[PDB]
Amino acid sequence: FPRIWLHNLGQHIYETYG
């Protein structure tokens, strides 16, 4: 489940387009 540490990685993308 992406909910694991794979979920915090999605937050990085936001900074790239933030």
UniProtKB/Swiss-Prot annotation:
It is found in: Virion; Host nucleus; Host extracellular space. It comes from the Viruses. Phosphorylated on several residues by host. These phosphorylations regulate VPR activity for the nuclear import of the HIV-1 pre-integration complex. Homooligomer, may form homodimer. Interacts with p6-gag region of the Pr55 Gag precursor protein through a (Leu-X-X)4 motif near the C-terminus of the P6gag protein. Interacts with host UNG. May interact with host RAD23A/HHR23A. Interacts with host VPRBP/DCAF1, leading to hijack the CUL4A-RBX1-DDB1-DCAF1/VPRBP complex, mediating ubiquitination of host proteins such as TERT and ZGPAT and arrest of the cell cycle in G2 phase. Belongs to the HIV-1 VPR protein family. HIV-1 lineages are divided in three main groups, M (for Major), O (for Outlier), and N (for New, or Non-M, Non-O). The vast majority of strains found worldwide belong to the group M. Group O seems to be endemic to and largely confined to Cameroon and neighboring countries in West Central Africa, where these viruses represent a small minority of HIV-1 strains. The group N is represented by a limited number of isolates from Cameroonian persons. The group M is further subdivided in 9 clades or subtypes (A to D, F to H, J and K). During virus replication, may deplete host UNG protein, and incude G2-M cell cycle arrest. Acts by targeting specific host proteins for degradation by the 26S proteasome, through association with the cellular CUL4A-DDB1 E3 ligase complex by direct interaction with host VPRPB/DCAF-1. Cell cycle arrest reportedly occurs within hours of infection and is not blocked by antiviral agents, suggesting that it is initiated by the VPR carried into the virion. Additionally, VPR induces apoptosis in a cell cycle dependent manner suggesting that these two effects are mechanistically linked. During virus entry, plays a role in the transport of the viral pre-integration (PIC) complex to the host nucleus. This function is crucial for viral infection of non-dividing macrophages. May act directly at the nuclear pore complex, by binding nucleoporins phenylalanine-glycine (FG)-repeat regions. This is Protein Vpr. The chain holds residues 34 to 51 of 96 of the full protein.
